[PDB]
Amino acid sequence: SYDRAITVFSPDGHLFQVEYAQEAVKKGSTAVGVRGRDIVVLGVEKKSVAKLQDERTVRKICALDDNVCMAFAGLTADARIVINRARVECQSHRLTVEDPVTVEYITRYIASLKQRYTQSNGRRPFGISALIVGFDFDGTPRLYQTDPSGTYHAWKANAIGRGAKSVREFLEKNYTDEAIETDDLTIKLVIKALLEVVQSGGKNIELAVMRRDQSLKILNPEEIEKYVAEIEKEKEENE
Amino acid sequence: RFSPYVFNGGTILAIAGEDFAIVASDTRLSEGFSIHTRDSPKCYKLTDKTVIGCSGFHGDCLTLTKIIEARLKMYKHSNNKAMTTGAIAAMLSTILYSRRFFPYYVYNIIGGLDEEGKGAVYSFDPVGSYQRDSFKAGGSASAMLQPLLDNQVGFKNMQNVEHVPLSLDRAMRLVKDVFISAAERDVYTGDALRICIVTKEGIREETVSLRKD
Amino acid sequence: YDRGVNTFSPEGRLFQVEYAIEAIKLGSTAIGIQTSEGVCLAVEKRITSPLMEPSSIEKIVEIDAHIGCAMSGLIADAKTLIDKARVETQNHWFTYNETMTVESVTQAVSNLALQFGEEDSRPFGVALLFGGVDEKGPQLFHMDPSGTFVQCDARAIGSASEGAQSSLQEVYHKSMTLKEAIKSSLIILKQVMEEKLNATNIELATVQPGQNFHMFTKEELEEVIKDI
Amino acid sequence: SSAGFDRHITIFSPEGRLYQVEYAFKAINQGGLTSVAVRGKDCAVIVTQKKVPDKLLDSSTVTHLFKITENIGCVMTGMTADSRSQVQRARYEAANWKYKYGYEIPVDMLCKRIADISQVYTQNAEMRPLGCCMILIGIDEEQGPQVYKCDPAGYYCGFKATAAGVKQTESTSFLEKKVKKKFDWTFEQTVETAITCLSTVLSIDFKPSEIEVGVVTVENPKFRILTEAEIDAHLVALAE
Amino acid sequence: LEGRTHIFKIHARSMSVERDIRFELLARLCPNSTGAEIRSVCTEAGMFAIRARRKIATEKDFLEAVNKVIKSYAKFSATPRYMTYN
Amino acid sequence: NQYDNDVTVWSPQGRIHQIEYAMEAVKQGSATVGLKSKTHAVLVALKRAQSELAAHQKKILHVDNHIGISIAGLTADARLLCNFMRQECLDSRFVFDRPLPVSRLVSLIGSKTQIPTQRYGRRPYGVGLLIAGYDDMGPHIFQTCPSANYFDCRAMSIGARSQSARTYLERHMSEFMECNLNELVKHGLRALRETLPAEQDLTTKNVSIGIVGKDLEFTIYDDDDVSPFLEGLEERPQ
Amino acid sequence: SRRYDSRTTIFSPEGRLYQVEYAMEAIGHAGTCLGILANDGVLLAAERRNIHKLLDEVFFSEKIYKLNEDMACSVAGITSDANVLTNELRLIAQRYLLQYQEPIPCEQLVTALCDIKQAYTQFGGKRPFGVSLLYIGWDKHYGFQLYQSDPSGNYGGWKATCIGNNSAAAVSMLKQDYKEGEMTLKSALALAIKVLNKTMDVSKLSAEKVEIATLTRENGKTVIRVLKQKEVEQLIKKHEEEEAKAEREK
Amino acid sequence: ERGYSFSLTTFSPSGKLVQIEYALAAVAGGAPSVGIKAANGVVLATEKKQKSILYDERSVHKVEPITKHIGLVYSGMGPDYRVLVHRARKLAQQYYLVYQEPIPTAQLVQRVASVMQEYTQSGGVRPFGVSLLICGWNEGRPYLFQSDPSGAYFAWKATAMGKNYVNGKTFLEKRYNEDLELEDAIHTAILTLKESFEGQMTEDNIEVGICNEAGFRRLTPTEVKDYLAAIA
Amino acid sequence: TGYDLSASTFSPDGRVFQVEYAMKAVENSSTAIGIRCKDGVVFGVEKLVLSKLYEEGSNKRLFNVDRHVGMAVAGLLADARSLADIAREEASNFRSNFGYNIPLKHLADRVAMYVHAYTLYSAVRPFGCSFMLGSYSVNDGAQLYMIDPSGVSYGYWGCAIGKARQAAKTEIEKLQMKEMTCRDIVKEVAKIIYIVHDEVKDKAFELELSWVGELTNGRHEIVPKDIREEAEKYAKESLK
């Protein structure tokens, strides 16, 4: 086939073109997410659409199953490969063990496949990352992360992408255990998050929500103006 | 055409004592009307604490015995110890299943010192199935052997049967008595009989001969 | 001067492998202790943010029934070695019907440690801590990324490695018991941890012949925290 | 003009010139071998000399000439390492030709194979380009005389007066106006000019043992390795 | 692993070390430090100190900007001294 | 240093520095001395470790009934050729049901290590094997090197300052062919303990011993097996 | 032997694949294409590379190739390197017809080619595809589908697309004249004609130096129509003539 | 062997391939070549001149037709010319097996340029400096095609190749008008051969093939002296 | 720079120094020779003993191929065993397909194919090993051949390798190629190799002998050194 060294181990403790390919994720658009006991939500910005044409097909969130939502950052090509590869995994786990895919099983596949994809020669690591948002079986929620080295870790809330420390510092209001007591408070939490993260706003904001067994729904640019109305009016209500 | 499955002869008898084991096999190699060699022991010692029997095709038993002993040094150089009796029986079953498409025609009985020193008797088949038994008799002479072993050794077919363990030499002279009456019909059983006495200290071998006419 | 990535050193040794040996120094700190009552161990989860979920990060895994393992530095490559070696432990139970000995995990891992080559693929920076109890009693084992195996009564890896072992050389002795090994190790652990001690900072890993598995259970570690 | 490893491998310069095989053109001068070929009307002649370090040199291994088949034969120049292997490849091509095709080889298609072989090795620079020069004769019906020379550049050309080597520039330039003109060619006439062209650069007039001289005429089409006796008879025949 | 504490004790008599500031805590966190940046590493406390008005500095203050300043300056440049002579 | 790039490129003097660099790791190993008399052979090695409580890694390990060996170099590649040596042991033990004369077997080890020296991207293997073996013609002591050049000797050594052992050997080793097993063993430590720095032991767990002969089967000797070897001698004069 | 390859696959100190930039320059040099809004039809326009009048031009469409009966694609880049993808995607759309015996929705077909376009990028240090092509056609679901291919692996599909540095000036004109249905095929003809009039530097906007193609939806024809030069001549002449009526604001 | 097959020829900062630019430079420094598609058939002329008097045109030919109805000319090196010709003869059978009929002109250009463009992305070397001129007669209208290393091919009536390909073509632009016949095509072929002459009007310094709707005809230099002796 | 690195890449002089680096690497080896009379072929090798170093008789450079053919090598010892084993088993192929002895002239063609091919590919390297090939038979005769790292297949009636080579084979011309009897030429060459290849530099050395020819009936083995001690029975008086 093709023999060559992808990246070699440097005494600095990490590889070069792999750990530095994290900048390809760092230069990507802002993406966040919030798990919840009732409804799980996420968000993305910097769509860079022309607004004169149909942008529906550039959507950054797909679904392997109705209960599984894929949220990624970075370039689209490696994301589409992560889509189709996880589709082979979710369908193989649909054939075998008919019940849907657990988050630990899909994260082990996506992360370790990328790891063994960084191992064998003649395979360049993906310049992308991803974080899973959804609901585990029997009503439990889920969120995890993915690393260019293929390590998965579960947070309480998801803040990544451009300005990961800026949005995480904005999560000081999200650390409240009362959030979210209702779905309207969850969307209001994403409203405050999307307003702060990052450049925004009014157009490039793209998100969706899923509550329990109900399939995910993408609201039209109508209620989004309503959530932006009460969020912008909340500043006038706080005086 | 050429038939790879052919019976070269041999007979296996193994009795498991309390702290000992008694294994016996006929040294007569007989295929058809001709007697090849009058001394052909089918009981070889894998280790000092274990002796396995052989029956059926000749070269298949020699090959299988050498393959088992070839893997003993692998496990010896790995864990710095020899293989347990139960591990040899299970590994042999996996070796017999690897050939399940076109396997050997072979019957073996593994015996020797186990963890506690008791005798071991395993019923083997070419497909690699097995369990732990007290006594088994292989070969074609098993017709009247098994019912009599169910009587004295197995303690069945008796009216008001008391149960007492058997001594070392009692089963010995029993093996000498049963093969005289078992050779009246089967032509594969006869000539010299290789006896293997398994003891806690070591394993001993002896020979008893029958008329060659 | 990058030549072949497989080139030796004039001192010398493999270039890329020795560079990854220095890469072990940035990993998490983990200290095992061998004790007749059982082999204990612990690790620092290294919380990177208050949002961290405690059960998602574990630096200790269970290979066989009584055999544990730990990870260092890079994770996913070691995590593959974990379950791939478990397949060899099940194949060990195939023929041998019993549990794999803790010493044979060396031949089950360190032999295949680095097979990497340009044709027919890159080394590892992770060192493993093998805990377990074989037929001869408790055994604590450790291996490097290059495959060199050594038996250690106590071994530390990652950042505090040199510092933890240098401090723990005095407190260790042949008469160390289990409960004493746990509470005397967390003294070093509370010294080598940056964050204030809580239930989410560190986890315990133990293996005993009569109590298992165990491993360890949560909310009991908090009972040991108030015993600090 | 050179980008990266260009100087050490085979690609095209701004003018499209190859750096490696132009070293193969000066790879012929090793040993100082000079082979000249003069093909007459009914005959074709080969002439080459040798260097003798000492008396331990074996007379059986003297011959640098190769024989493809009983009808046709070859002569090589340059480094002997590439010549012996390329001749063995000609043995494989001739044996496979008679096998599958089952008739006489034109010697033109053999030079087509070697021309592509040395070219295919010139293609990929990770194997040695094999800059050895391939020179043959030929015997074929209705075509009269045949001489073909496969050059290391990957093409095949040869005719009545054709030669390759270090000093062939001088000699063949003299053979331009010397050969034709009108000059008719007999056996002793083609061998004579084969000596005179050697007498242009050398003019040593050494005993016949040093030269390696093949000749093939059409009476019996089989080519014969020459014995120093008949060359000595031609050496006293060329002295006036 | 050790001499960094002296390169962190070149700042010992500098400033006034807060009683809870620890050397080993930061020393164990900085591989391949040379002396150059890690002299400014202790110095960039005083950077944000004067900027944030901090009267003296706590080890947590710069180690926030240290893990920054090591990574932020190791993102583009690892300064591969091993590579320079190799 | 572009001429040292690969094993393919030859040095200006017609040498390969990659083999020379592999000879370094062979000398960086522990001092070990194998030896043989006219009748029986003994081989002695040195165990070392990292920390105090770290157990000393064993050098001498069993291979075949008549084959003892020392070891040094990368332990991963050592076990690779060790299990490969088991594949060579089962060759004649299976087909011929008798062991292999070691002379032609080490020559096959040389051809085994020849391919990694030739092709690009392939590296040699640092090997510290001191191979004792017995065919019917008596003992054999073979040194091993990445260049795969083996010497049949009465004794040799590889490790740190292992030449000083040979300097003490020659006049003594000429008379060591006569002696029997016991003293032939402690003649091994009559080498090692000089190759060891004079400021430290020479303990029980840092030394490796094994003995093999034509009629004797090889066994690993350590810990309590070293009791007769340590006693009966004296310390080196200061 | 590791120093010969230029590491086109391996990542670059800039944080991204370095060869993709020069790839976007390959398509971004001399490539001229565009797209028009789709209302009950669609059309295509490009630039004819041939400046020689002695050429035969017997191949009918020059830069536009027909992958399927009801679906074709515009292409920009190296000719033969694109022609490899023409027959390749034609066979991928053919093996889909070999599967369902039914046409191919462009969505999964474009993503399939994107998975093929990343092959040279992700292994071996291979030279990535120097060709970026458009997409047109019709499907049973979304009707007229106009997509776009990117060297980075994305499908950048819009109903109005831009290809080339010279066509980058048309994006402002595309949004200045932007409407939706509304626009007739004839309005898109004058829209793309004024696009070339603003972008292309050819004096008077010669009709024979630029390529124009159209498409229609007919039952069950759905013809991809290659047009004679007669209607394009009178089109651009009537276009700049309408522009002569558009300068009356003075 | 090695078997690297990497793509090492890469994009220039301008986006082009510098190696292919060196390839077209080998074509620009190539031998003068011309062909004319007019009316009934196509005429090929170019030039062949030996380095000395030692060589003759009776054996080795620079022009070898691909089929009986299809001829071919080219510029650049001969060794790689016969290589792509060898592949063209083999590929002709891959076509003939399914069709059992002769082959159209452009049908060769499609698959040859595809393998040629494949040989670019493929490892090792490239199309080199051989720019092939494919001609033939099918469907009543003959054709003359030429491709380049990068695989770009165009159709026309006539063109000039090799050295002075721009000057000779500008002369053919004024001379060739409307349509021409086979005799007129050969006549202006002598004109473009006299452009770089050297060896025009002499039968042994050139070789003339001619395509016709009845199939390609390769005439010996004897007929080249017949029509042109007496040239023009 | 570095035109000498790869073996598949030429140099401005028209060759590759990898072959040249291997040539002078053989020059550091000790004496490796051969000589053939009418009755057989004499072989000898001088062993260099650094210190002890080990027991006598181990790992001698004299090797064997078939009963009628044997190897006397030079240069690197491991790759010498390599090519020795390759030519060793190669005779089994000729013995399997035919069943008679392999001609030595065409047996060197195999090693010529192996060494030359290793110079062709850039991945592998050339072997730095040379050697001598000789043999005698009643149906064949005496053929001695010499192969070097360049892959040259050639032979002389006698030849030398190592530090002293041209000076060692000079006076060998006194020993005739035919009229002499190689049985007596054993000690005749022994006096040359003992005097030549100066041992004043390294005082510790050793000498080996072998032979093949008609006296052993086409058998190649070592003529006994312990019997008659023909080596130093004479040469001790030759230098004084």
Swiss-Prot record, chain A:
This is Proteasome subunit alpha type-7. PROSITE patterns: PROTEASOME_ALPHA_1, PROTEASOME_ALPHA_2. The gene is PSMA7. Induction: Down-regulated by the ribozyme Rz3'X. Up-regulated in colorectal cancer tissues. Its main location: cytoplasm. It comes from Homo sapiens. Phosphorylation by ABL1 or ABL2 leads to an inhibition of proteasomal activity and cell cycle transition blocks. Keywords: Acetylation, Cytoplasm, Glycoprotein, Host-virus interaction, Nucleus, Phosphoprotein, Proteasome. Gene3D superfamilies: Glutamine Phosphoribosylpyrophosphate, subunit 1, domain 1.
Swiss-Prot record, chain C:
The modification Phosphothreonine is found at residue 48. Keywords: Acetylation, Cytoplasm, Glycoprotein, Nucleus, Phosphoprotein, Proteasome. The modification Phosphoserine is found at residues 9, 49, 56. InterPro entries: Ntn_hydrolases_N, Proteasome_alpha, Proteasome_alpha-type, Proteasome_alpha_type_5, Proteasome_asu_N, Proteasome_sua/b. Its main location: cytoplasm. Disulfide bonds: none annotated. One of its GO terms (biological process) is proteasome-mediated ubiquitin-dependent protein catabolic process. One of its GO terms (cellular component) is nucleoplasm. The keyword Iron does not apply. Expressed in fetal brain (at protein level). Induction: Up-regulated in colon cancer cell lines. Up-regulated in fetal Down syndrome (DS) brain (at protein level). May be the target of the transcriptional activator NFE2L2. Glycans are attached at residue 185. It is found in: Cytoplasm; Nucleus. SUPFAM superfamilies: N-terminal nucleophile aminohydrolases (Ntn hydrolases). Transmembrane segments: none annotated. NCBIfam families: PRK03996.1. Belongs to the peptidase T1A family. Component of the 20S core proteasome complex involved in the proteolytic degradation of most intracellular proteins. This complex plays numerous essential roles within the cell by associating with different regulatory particles. Associated with two 19S regulatory particles, forms the 26S proteasome and thus participates in the ATP-dependent degradation of ubiquitinated proteins. This is Proteasome subunit alpha type-5. It comes from Homo sapiens. The gene is PSMA5.
Curated annotation (Swiss-Prot), chain F:
It comes from the Eukaryota. GO terms for biological process: immune system process; negative regulation of inflammatory response to antigenic stimulus; proteasome-mediated ubiquitin-dependent protein catabolic process. One of its GO terms (molecular function) is lipopolysaccharide binding. GO terms for cellular component: centrosome; cytoplasm; cytosol; extracellular exosome; nucleoplasm; nucleus; proteasome complex; proteasome core complex. InterPro entries: Ntn_hydrolases_N, Proteasome_alpha, Proteasome_alpha-type, Proteasome_alpha1, Proteasome_asu_N, Proteasome_sua/b. Keywords: Acetylation, Cytoplasm, Glycoprotein, Immunity, Isopeptide bond, Nucleus, Phosphoprotein, Proteasome, Ubl conjugation. Its main location: cytoplasm. Pfam families: Proteasome, Proteasome_A_N. Glycans are attached at residue 107. There is a cross-link at residues 112, 205 (Glycyl lysine isopeptide (Lys-Gly) (interchain with G-Cter in ubiquitin)). It is found in: Cytoplasm; Nucleus. The 26S proteasome consists of a 20S proteasome core and two 19S regulatory subunits. The 20S proteasome core is a barrel-shaped complex made of 28 subunits that are arranged in four stacked rings. The two outer rings are each formed by seven alpha subunits, and the two inner rings are formed by seven beta subunits. The proteolytic activity is exerted by three beta-subunits PSMB5, PSMB6 and PSMB7. Interacts with NOTCH3. Interacts with ZFAND1. This is Proteasome subunit alpha type-1. The lineage of its organism: Eukaryota, Metazoa, Chordata, Craniata, Vertebrata.
From Swiss-Prot, chain G:
Its main location: cytoplasm. InterPro entries: Ntn_hydrolases_N (IPR029055), Proteasome_alpha (IPR050115), Proteasome_alpha-type (IPR023332), Proteasome_asu_N (IPR000426), Proteasome_bsu_CS (IPR016050), Proteasome_sua/b (IPR001353). This is Proteasome subunit alpha type-4. Pfam families: Proteasome, Proteasome_A_N. The modification Phosphoserine is found at residues 12, 74, 172. Transmembrane segments: none annotated. One of its GO terms (biological process) is proteasome-mediated ubiquitin-dependent protein catabolic process. The 26S proteasome consists of a 20S proteasome core and two 19S regulatory subunits. The 20S proteasome core is a barrel-shaped complex made of 28 subunits that are arranged in four stacked rings. The two outer rings are each formed by seven alpha subunits, and the two inner rings are formed by seven beta subunits. The proteolytic activity is exerted by three beta-subunits PSMB5, PSMB6 and PSMB7. It is found in: Cytoplasm; Nucleus. One of its GO terms (cellular component) is proteasome core complex. Induction: Down-regulated by antioxidants BO-653 and probucol. The modification N6-acetyllysine is found at residues 126, 175. Belongs to the peptidase T1A family. Component of the 20S core proteasome complex involved in the proteolytic degradation of most intracellular proteins. This complex plays numerous essential roles within the cell by associating with different regulatory particles. Associated with two 19S regulatory particles, forms the 26S proteasome and thus participates in the ATP-dependent degradation of ubiquitinated proteins.
